Short mmCIF file of C-alpha atoms and ligand atoms in Angstrom, two decimals:
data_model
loop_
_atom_site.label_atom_id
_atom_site.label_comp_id
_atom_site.label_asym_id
_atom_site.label_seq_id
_atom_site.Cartn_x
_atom_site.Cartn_y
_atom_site.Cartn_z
CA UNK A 1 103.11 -30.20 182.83
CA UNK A 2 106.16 -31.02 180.65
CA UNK A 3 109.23 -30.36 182.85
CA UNK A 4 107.57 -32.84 185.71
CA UNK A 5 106.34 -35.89 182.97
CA UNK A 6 108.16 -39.35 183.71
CA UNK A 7 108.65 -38.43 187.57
CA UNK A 8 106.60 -39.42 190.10
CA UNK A 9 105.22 -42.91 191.89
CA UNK A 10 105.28 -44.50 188.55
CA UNK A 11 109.11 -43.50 187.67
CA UNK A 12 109.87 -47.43 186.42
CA UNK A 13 113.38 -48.24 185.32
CA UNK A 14 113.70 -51.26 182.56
CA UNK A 15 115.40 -54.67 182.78
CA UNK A 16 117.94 -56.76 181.24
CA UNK A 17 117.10 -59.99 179.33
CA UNK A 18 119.44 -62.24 177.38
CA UNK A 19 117.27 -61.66 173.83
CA UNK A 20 113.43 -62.96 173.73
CA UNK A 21 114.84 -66.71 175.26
CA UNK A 22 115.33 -65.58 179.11
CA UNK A 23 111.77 -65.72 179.83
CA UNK A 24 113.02 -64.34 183.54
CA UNK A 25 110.33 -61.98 185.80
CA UNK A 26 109.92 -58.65 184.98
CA UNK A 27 111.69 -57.79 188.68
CA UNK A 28 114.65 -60.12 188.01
CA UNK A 29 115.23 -58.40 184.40
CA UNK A 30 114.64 -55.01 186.71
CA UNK A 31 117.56 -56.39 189.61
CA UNK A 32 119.63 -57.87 186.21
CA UNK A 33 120.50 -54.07 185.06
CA UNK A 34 120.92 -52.41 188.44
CA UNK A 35 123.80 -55.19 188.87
CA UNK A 36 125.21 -54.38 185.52
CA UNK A 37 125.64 -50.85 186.63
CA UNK A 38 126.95 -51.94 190.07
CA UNK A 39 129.28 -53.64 188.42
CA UNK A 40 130.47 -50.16 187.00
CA UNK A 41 131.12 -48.46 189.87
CA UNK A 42 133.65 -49.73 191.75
CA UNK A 43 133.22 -48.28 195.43
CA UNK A 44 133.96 -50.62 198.50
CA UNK A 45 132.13 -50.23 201.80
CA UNK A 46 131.83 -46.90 203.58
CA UNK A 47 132.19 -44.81 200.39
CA UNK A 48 129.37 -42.26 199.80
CA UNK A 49 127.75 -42.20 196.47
CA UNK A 50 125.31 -39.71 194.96
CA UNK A 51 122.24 -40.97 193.25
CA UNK A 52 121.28 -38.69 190.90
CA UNK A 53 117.90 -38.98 189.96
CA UNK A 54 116.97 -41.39 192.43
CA UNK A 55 113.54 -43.29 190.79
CA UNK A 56 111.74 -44.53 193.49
CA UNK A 57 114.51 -45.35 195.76
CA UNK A 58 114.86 -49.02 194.84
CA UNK A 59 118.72 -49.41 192.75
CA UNK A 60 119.84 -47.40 195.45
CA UNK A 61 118.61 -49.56 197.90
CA UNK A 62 120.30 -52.61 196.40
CA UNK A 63 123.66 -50.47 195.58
CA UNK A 64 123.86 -49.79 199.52
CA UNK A 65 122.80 -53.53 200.19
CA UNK A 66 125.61 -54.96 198.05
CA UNK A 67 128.67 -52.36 198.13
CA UNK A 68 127.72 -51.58 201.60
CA UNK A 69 128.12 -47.73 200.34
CA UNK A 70 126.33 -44.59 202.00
CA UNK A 71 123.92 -42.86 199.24
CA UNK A 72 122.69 -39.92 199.36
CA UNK A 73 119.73 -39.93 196.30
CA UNK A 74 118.19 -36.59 194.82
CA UNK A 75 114.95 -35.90 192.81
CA UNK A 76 112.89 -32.67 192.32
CA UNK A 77 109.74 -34.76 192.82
CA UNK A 78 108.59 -34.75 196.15
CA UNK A 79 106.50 -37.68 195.81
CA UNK A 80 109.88 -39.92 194.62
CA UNK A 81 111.73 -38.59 197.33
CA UNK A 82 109.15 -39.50 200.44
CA UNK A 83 108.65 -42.75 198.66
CA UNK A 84 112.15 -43.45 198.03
CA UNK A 85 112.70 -42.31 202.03
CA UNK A 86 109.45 -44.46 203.22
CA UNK A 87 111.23 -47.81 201.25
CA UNK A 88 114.79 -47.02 203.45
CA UNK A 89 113.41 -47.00 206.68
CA UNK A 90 111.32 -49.88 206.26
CA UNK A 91 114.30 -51.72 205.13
CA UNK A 92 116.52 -50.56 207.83
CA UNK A 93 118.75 -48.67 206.41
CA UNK A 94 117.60 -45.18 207.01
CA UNK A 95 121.31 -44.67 208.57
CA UNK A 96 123.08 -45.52 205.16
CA UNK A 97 120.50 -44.25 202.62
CA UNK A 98 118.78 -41.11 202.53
CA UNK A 99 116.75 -38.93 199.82
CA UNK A 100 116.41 -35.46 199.68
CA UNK A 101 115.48 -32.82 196.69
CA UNK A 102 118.02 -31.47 194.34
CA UNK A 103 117.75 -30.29 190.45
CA UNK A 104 121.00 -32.08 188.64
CA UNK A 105 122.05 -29.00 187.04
CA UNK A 106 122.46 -27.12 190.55
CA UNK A 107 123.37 -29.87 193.06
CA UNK A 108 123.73 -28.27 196.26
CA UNK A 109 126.83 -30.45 197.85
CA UNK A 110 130.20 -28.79 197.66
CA UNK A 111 132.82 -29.69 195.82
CA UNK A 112 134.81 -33.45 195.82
CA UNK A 113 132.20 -34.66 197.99
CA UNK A 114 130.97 -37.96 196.64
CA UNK A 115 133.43 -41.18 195.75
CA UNK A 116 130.82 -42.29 193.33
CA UNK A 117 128.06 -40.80 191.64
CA UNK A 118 124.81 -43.26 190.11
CA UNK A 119 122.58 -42.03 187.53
CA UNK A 120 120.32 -44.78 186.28
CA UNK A 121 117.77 -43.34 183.53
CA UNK A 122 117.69 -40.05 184.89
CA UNK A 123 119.99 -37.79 182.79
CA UNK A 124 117.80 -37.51 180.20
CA UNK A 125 115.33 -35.39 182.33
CA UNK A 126 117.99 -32.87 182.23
CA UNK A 127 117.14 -29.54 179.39
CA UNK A 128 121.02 -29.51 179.92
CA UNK A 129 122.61 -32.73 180.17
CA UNK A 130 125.88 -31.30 179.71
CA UNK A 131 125.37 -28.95 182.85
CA UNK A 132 124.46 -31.70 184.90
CA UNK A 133 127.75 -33.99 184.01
CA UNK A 134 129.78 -31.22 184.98
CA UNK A 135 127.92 -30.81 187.98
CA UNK A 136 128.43 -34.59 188.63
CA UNK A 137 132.16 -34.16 187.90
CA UNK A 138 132.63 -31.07 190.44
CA UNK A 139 130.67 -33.10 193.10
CA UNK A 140 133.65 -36.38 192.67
CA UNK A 141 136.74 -36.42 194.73
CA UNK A 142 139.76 -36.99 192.42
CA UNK A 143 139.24 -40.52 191.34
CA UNK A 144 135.56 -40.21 191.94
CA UNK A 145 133.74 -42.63 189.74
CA UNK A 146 130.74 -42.26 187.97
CA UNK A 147 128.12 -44.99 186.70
CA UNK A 148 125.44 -43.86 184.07
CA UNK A 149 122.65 -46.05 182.36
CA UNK A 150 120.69 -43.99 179.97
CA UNK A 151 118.15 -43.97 176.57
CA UNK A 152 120.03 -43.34 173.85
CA UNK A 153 118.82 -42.91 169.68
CA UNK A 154 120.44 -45.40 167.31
CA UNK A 155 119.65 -43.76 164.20
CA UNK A 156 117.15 -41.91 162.30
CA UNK A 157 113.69 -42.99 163.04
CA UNK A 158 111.33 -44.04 159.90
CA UNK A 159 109.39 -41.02 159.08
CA UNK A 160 105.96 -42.90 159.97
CA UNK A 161 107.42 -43.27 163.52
CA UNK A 162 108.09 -39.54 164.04
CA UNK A 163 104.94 -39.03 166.01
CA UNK A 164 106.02 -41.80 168.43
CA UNK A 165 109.62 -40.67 169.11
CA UNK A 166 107.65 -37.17 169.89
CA UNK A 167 104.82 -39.10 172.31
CA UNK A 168 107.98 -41.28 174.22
CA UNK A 169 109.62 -37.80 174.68
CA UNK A 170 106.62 -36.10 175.63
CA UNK A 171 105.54 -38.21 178.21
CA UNK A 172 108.54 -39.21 179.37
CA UNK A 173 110.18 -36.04 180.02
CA UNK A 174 112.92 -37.30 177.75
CA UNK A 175 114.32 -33.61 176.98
CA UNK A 176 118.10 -34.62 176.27
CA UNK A 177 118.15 -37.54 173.84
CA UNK A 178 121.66 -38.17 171.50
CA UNK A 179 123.73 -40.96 170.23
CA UNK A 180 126.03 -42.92 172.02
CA UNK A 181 129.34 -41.08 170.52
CA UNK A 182 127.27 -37.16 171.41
CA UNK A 183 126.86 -38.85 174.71
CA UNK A 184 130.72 -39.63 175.27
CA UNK A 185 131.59 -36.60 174.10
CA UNK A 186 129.73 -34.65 176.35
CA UNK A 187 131.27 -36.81 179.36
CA UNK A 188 134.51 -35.63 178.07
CA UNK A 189 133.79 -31.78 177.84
CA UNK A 190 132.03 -32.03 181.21
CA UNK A 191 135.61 -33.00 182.41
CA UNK A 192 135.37 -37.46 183.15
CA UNK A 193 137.65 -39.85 181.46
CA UNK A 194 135.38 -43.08 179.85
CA UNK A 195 136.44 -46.06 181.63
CA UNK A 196 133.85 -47.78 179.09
CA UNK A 197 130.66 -47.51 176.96
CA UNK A 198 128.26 -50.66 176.17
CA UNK A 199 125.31 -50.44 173.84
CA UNK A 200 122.85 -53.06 175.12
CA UNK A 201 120.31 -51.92 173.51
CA UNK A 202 118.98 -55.33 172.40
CA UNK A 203 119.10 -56.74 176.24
CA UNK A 204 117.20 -53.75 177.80
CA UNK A 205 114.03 -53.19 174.39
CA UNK A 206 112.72 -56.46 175.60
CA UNK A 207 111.56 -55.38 178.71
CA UNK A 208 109.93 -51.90 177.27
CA UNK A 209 106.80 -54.28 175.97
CA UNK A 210 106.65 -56.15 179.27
CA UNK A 211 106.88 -53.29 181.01
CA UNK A 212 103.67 -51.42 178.99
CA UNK A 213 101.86 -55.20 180.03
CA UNK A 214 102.76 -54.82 183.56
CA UNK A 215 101.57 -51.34 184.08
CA UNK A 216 98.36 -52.10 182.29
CA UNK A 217 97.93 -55.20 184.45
CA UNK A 218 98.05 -52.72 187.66
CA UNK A 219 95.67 -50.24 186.05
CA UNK A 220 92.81 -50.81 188.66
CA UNK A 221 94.89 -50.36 191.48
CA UNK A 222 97.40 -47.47 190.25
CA UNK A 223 94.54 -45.31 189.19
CA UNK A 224 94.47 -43.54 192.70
CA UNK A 225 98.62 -42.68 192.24
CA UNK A 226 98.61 -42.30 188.93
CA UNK A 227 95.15 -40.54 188.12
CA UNK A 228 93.10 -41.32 184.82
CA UNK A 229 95.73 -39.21 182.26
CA UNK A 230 98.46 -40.34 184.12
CA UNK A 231 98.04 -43.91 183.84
CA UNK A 232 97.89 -43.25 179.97
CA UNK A 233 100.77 -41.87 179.68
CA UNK A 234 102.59 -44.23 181.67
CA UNK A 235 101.38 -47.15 179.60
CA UNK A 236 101.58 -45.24 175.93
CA UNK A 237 105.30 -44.33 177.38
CA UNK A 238 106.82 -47.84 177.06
CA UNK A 239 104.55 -49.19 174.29
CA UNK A 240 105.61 -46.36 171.83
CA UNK A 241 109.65 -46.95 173.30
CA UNK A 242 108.47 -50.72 172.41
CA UNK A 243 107.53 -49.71 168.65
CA UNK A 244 110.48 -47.80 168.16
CA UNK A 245 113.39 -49.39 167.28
CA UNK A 246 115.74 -46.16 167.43
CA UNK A 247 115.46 -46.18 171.35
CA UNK A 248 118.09 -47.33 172.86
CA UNK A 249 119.88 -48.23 175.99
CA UNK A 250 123.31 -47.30 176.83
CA UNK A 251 126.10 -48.04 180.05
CA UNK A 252 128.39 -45.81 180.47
CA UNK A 253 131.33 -45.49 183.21
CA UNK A 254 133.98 -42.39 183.77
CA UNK A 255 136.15 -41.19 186.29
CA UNK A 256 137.32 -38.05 187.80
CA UNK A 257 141.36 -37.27 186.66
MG1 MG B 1 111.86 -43.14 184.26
#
C-alpha cells in the first residue's frame, strides 16, 4: 504494498482536452496540462524549483526547458528517481535538472531554499497532506511560489460506486483525497496565500479512459516493468477514475507571505 502503489515506472500523469471534440494525442493532452501548471508558477530563468513528487521526470523536464529554471525533483521510489535521472542526461540537461529521494513530509533542504515549488499529482500520496504543504511552505523563500495539480472528490459518490472509489484509492496510493474548499484550506493553515484555484475537472476525466486504452495497448511490452499484478492495477487504476464521476482534477497556485 500500500504505501508504494501508484509509484514506480508506470507513475502516468493525465492530460488536458477541450471536452470529447479535441480529438488531440494522448502526449499533447499530457504536454497541454504540464503548460497549464507552468503557467502557474511564475519563475524566470535561473530560479531553482522543487519538484515534489517528481513522476517519471518528464513535467520537470519541460518546466526546465521552458522557464529555463534549475529543479531539483524528489520521490521515495528509487526506480522514478534513476528513470527520471536517466531521461535528464540524455536530454542534456543533467546540469539544470537533477532527482534525488526525499519523503514530502520530511524534505531534507533547509529552510527558504527553493523560489518555486511543483507538485503535479503527487500530494495525494501523502498520509499527511497537510504536513507536506507546510513542509513545501518552509522550503520557499519569502515570495516563493508554489504550483499544485491534484485529484480532488466533487461530491458524494453513488453508493454502487463505493467499491470503485476504494479500488482507484487502493491502487493508486491515493491516501489524502478532499474537496476543493478542504484543499484550500489546508494551503492556508500550512501557511501559503491562494493566488488561484481552477476546477477542470471536465478537461482532465477525458483523458482517464484514454489513458486505461493506452496502457492496455502497451501490455505486451510493459509486462517486464510492470509485472503481471502490476499491469492490472495500472489499467483498473484509470478505468475505475474513468467510471467515477466524483474524481476530480484541481489547479491550484499560492505563495509564500
Ligand atoms: Mg500517478
Amino acid at each position: 504494498s500500500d504505501p508504494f502503489a501508484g509509484l514506480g515506472a508506470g507513475n502516468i500523469h493525465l492530460g488536458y482536452f477541450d471536452g470529447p471534440d479535441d480529438a488531440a494525442t494522448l502526449a499533447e493532452a499530457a504536454d497541454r496540462l504540464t503548460d497549464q501548471l507552468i503557467a502557474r508558477l511564475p519563475v524566470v530563468r535561473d530560479h531553482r524549483v522543487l519538484d515534489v513528487g517528481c513522476g517519471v521526470g518528464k513535467p520537470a523536464l519541460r518546466l526546465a526547458g521552458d522557464l529555463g529554471v534549475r529543479v531539483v525533483g524528489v520521490s521515495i521510489s528509487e526506480a522514478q528517481i534513476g528513470i527520471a535521472n536517466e531521461a535528464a542526461r540524455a536530454a542534456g540537461l543533467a546540469d539544470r535538472v537533477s532527482f534525488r529521494y526525499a519523503d514530502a513530509m520530511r524534505l531534507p533542504f533547509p529552510d527558504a531554499s527553493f523560489d518555486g515549488v511543483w507538485a503535479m499529482e503527487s500530494l495525494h500520496h501523502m498520509p499527511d497532506r497537510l504536513q507536506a504543504l507546510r513542509e513545501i511552505a518552509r522550503v520557499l523563500r519569502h515570495g516563493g511560489v508554489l504550483s499544485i495539480a491534484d485529484f480532488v472528490q466533487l461530491g458524494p459518490v453513488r453508493e454502487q460506486d463505493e467499491e470503485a472509489l476504494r479500488a482507484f484509492r487502493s491502487g493508486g496510493g491515493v491516501h489524502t483525497l478532499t474537496g476543493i474548499a478542504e484543499y484550500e484550506a489546508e494551503i492556508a493553515d500550512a501557511g501559503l496565500t491562494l493566488t488561484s484555484s481552477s476546477d477542470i475537472s471536465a478537461n482532465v476525466r477525458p483523458s482517464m479512459v484514454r489513458t486505461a486504452e493506452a496502457i492496455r495497448g502497451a501490455a505486451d511490452a510493459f509486462l517486464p516493468l510492470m509485472g503481471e499484478e502490476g499491469l492490472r492495477r495500472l489499467i483498473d487504476n484509470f478505468e475505475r477514475a474513468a467510471t467515477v464521476p466524483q474524481i476530480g482534477y484541481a489547479l491550484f497556485a499560492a505563495r509564500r507571505s
